[PDB]
Amino acid sequence: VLSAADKTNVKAAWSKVGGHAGEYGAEALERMFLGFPTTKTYFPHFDLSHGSAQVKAHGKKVGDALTLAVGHLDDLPGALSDLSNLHAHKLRVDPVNFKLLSHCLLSTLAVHLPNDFTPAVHASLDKFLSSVSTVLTSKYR
Amino acid sequence: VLSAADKTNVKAAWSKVGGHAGEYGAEALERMFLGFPTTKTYFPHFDLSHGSAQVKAHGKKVGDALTLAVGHLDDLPGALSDLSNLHAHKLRVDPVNFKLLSHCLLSTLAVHLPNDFTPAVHASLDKFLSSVSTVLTSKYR
Amino acid sequence: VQLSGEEKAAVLALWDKVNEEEVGGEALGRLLVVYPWTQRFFDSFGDLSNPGAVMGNPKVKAHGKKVLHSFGEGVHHLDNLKGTFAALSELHCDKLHVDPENFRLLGNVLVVVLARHFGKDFTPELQASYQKVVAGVANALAHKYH
Amino acid sequence: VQLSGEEKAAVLALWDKVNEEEVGGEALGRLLVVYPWTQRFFDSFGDLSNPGAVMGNPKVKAHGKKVLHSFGEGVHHLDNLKGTFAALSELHCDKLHVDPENFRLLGNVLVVVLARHFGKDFTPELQASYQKVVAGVANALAHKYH
Numbered sequence: 001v002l003s004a005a006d007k008t009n010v011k012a013a014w015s016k017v018g019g020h021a022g023e024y025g026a027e028a029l030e031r032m033f034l035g036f037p038t039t040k041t042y043f044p045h046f047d048l049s050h051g052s053a054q055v056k057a058h059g060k061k062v063g064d065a066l067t068l069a070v071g072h073l074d075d076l077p078g079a080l081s082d083l084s085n086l087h088a089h090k091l092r093v094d095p096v097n098f099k100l101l102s103h104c105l106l107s108t109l110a111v112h113l114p115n116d117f118t119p120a121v122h123a124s125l126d127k128f129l130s131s132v133s134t135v136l137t138s139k140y141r
Numbered sequence: 142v143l144s145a146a147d148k149t150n151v152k153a154a155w156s157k158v159g160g161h162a163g164e165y166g167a168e169a170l171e172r173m174f175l176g177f178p179t180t181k182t183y184f185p186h187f188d189l190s191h192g193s194a195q196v197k198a199h200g201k202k203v204g205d206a207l208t209l210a211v212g213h214l215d216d217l218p219g220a221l222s223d224l225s226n227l228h229a230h231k232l233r234v235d236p237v238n239f240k241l242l243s244h245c246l247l248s249t250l251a252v253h254l255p256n257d258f259t260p261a262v263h264a265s266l267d268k269f270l271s272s273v274s275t276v277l278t279s280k281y282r
Numbered sequence: 283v284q285l286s287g288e289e290k291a292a293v294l295a296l297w298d299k300v301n302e303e304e305v306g307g308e309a310l311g312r313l314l315v316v317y318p319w320t321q322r323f324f325d326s327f328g329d330l331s332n333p334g335a336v337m338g339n340p341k342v343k344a345h346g347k348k349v350l351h352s353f354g355e356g357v358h359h360l361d362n363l364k365g366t367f368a369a370l371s372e373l374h375c376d377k378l379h380v381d382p383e384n385f386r387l388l389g390n391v392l393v394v395v396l397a398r399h400f401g402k403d404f405t406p407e408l409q410a411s412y413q414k415v416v417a418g419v420a421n422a423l424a425h426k427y428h
Numbered sequence: 429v430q431l432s433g434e435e436k437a438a439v440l441a442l443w444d445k446v447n448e449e450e451v452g453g454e455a456l457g458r459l460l461v462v463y464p465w466t467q468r469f470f471d472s473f474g475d476l477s478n479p480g481a482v483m484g485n486p487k488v489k490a491h492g493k494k495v496l497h498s499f500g501e502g503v504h505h506l507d508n509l510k511g512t513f514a515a516l517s518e519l520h521c522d523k524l525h526v527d528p529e530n531f532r533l534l535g536n537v538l539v540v541v542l543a544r545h546f547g548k549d550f551t552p553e554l555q556a557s558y559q560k561v562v563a564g565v566a567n568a569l570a571h572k573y574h
């Protein structure tokens with residue numbers, strides 16, 4: 001996955017996202033919690049109410065994490081090694097959930113950058129997210 | 142992503158398959174065609190009758206392809222490059238079908254190697270088949 | 283499937299503001315581009331070699347409108363879906379042989395396309411409601427697979 | 429599900445030979461090992477850190493037997509899967525919130541286990557029949573998701 005052309009699209013497209021990564025991560029999460037209830041399970045200690053300071057804060061974590069990955073497409077297994085241990089070994093998140101977040105994330109991007117969300121960029125951004133999901137759900141150790 | 146323990150498990154279990162990879166491939170295919178009729182769609186030119194020499198021949202190709210993959214666990218993308226282009230670009234095989242063939246391969250292996258098909262082995266062989274399926278469905282790098 | 287009384291309201295409301303001329307064709311096109319293997323069922327449509335040809339193809343908009351049409355029939359007959367899509371079911375199952383999982387993927391792109399079209403009016407609540415409708419329609423077309 | 433009269437006879441005849449304890453204990457154990465994230469639902473069972481601790485755990489064997497007995501109810505009521513699993517569907521969907529994909533995984537794991545215990549008697553024809561029964565149970569359990 002992730003060919004020369006996809007990388008160019010990913011790097012370019014994240015560029016259009018800029019510093020709203022944090023805000024988009026928060027919106028994506030809210031869309032996931034409301035759209036796919038089964039995912040509320042992993043956050044028993046959170047305030048899942050509209051406008052939560054925990055959700056918004058967490059969304060920020062997800063945002064930088066994705067920005068980090070976009071800068072290490074040649075070695076995702078390495079740059080994300082820690083998050084992988086957290087999600088697959090410690091938290092044991094079900095892989096299906098990653099597709100849901102990915103969907104909610106793309107849906108968030110379609111909302112805010114309708115003119116940059118072309119079919120081609122859509123296709124590249126989908127593969128990028130799958131690859132990140134495989135690494136975080138991987139247990140390569 | 143395959144770990145070290147998984148690579149060792151796979152190379153060891155396949156040592157047990159030995160020279161029966163071809164037979165198991167044919168049985169796998171026979172189990173798939175009867176278990177999930179939809180897959181026949183992809184073989185309009187084949188004689189899918191029982192004991193068909195056409196299925197045995199193909200089963201052999203699949204068996205060899207897998208023995209080849211076991212020899213290049215460290216670089217599946219490179220060793221299976223041509224098969225990917227054939228399955229993704231020309232044939233356009235729905236990725237769902239790969240899970241069906243993998244389940245039939247594991248089933249076939251459980252039948253013939255009941256004492257060696259332990260939980261640990263079962264687990265690694267599954268990561269291995271998902272890993273091979275990823276490569277063959279990707280229009281990658 | 284089931285939605286609140288006030289849910290159908292917000293849902294059907296949005297559906298009236300939909301361009302049946304476009305949405306249908308953009309959903310199908312995005313499906314053909316993001317998940318290329320689906321192109322295997324649409325060979326007779328002609329050129330699908332690149333995103334430019336697909337979104338431009340005439341048969342994709344035409345067929346797209348038919349698809350977006352039977353989706354509306356879904357938005358209305360929400361409490362009897364198994365019946366409405368019963369015929370299309372034996373069609374995609376018996377003739378075409380389309381895997382159930384693909385109905386889910388088209389439903390999700392349809393959602394994303396709606397998102398690109400209505401922007402912020404397409405709120406997480408509204409999106410949540412549509413995930414229900416999308417899920418039911420998908421399940422109904424799969425009934426004949428047992 | 430509806431299988432040919434001959435199939436039923438074949439499926440039911442194999443089940444007379446199934447030891448619910450041995451089979452169930454191994455099926456649930458393999459699930460926990462091959463798909464580690466399923467472990468989250470059983471943290472109360474104790475140490476599941478390694479395959480040796482999982483296969484040896486007494487609660488895994490005990491719950492395994494209960495699960496296999498439930499499949500047996502399905503195999504003897506193939507005409508009424510929906511009604512047979514209605515209660516378990518509420519438990520797994522509404523109460524526990526388990527993703528439906530896992531039901532299929534457990535169904536296939538079960539098939540692999542049967543293949544290992546019956547070897548050559550588990551012919552590709554008998555398996556094909558069992559993929560139907562297993563597929564049948566999965567959908568009925570996912571019935572509350574629709």
Ligand code: HEM
Nearest residue numbers: 039042043061062065066083087091093097098101132136
């Ligand atoms: C795009 C994929 C995802 C990325 C990049 C991501 C990233 C992160 C990061 C950076 C952290 C650590 C933050 C910290 O140190 O406090 C984290 C924690 C966490 N993630 Fe994810 N995550 C993703 C998907 C998931 C999914 C799908 C779930 C489940 C629905 C999930 C559940 C959690 C939980 C429960 C925590 C710990 C929350 C806490 O206690 O603060 N993550 N994630």
Ligand code: HEM
Nearest residue numbers: 180183184202203206207224228232234238239242273277
């Ligand atoms: C475990 C993954 C699989 C492997 C290792 C595999 C391997 C192969 C190989 C080695 C060939 C090469 C034939 C040659 O050049 O001599 C081939 C051809 C082919 N494969 Fe696969 N395959 C796999 C899964 C699938 C699946 C899931 C389908 C669809 C159900 C599929 C459909 C085909 C078809 C139709 C051909 C062409 C056969 C012909 O017309 O001769 N393959 N595959």
Ligand code: HEM
Nearest residue numbers: 320323324348349352353374378380384385388389419423
């Ligand atoms: C939400 C699910 C879908 C809906 C509501 C839908 C709806 C339709 C409708 C209304 C028709 C026209 C039938 C007629 O006019 O008699 C049709 C035909 C067809 N559909 Fe679907 N469909 C869906 C998903 C799929 C998927 C995922 C595929 C792609 C693999 C697919 C492939 C086809 C094909 C190949 C035809 C034949 C078109 C022709 O040659 O005229 N459909 N579908």
Ligand code: HEM
Nearest residue numbers: 466469470494495498499516524526530531534535565569
């Ligand atoms: C083939 C599908 C399955 C069947 C037939 C099945 C059957 C059952 C049955 C009969 C019970 C025992 C109820 C009782 O003792 O009153 C049960 C409980 C439960 N099931 Fe399942 N189950 C299935 C799949 C799953 C999956 C995949 C998960 C895990 C991800 C799961 C998680 C649970 C949990 C957490 C309980 C409560 C355990 C306890 O405290 O006794 N089940 N299931």
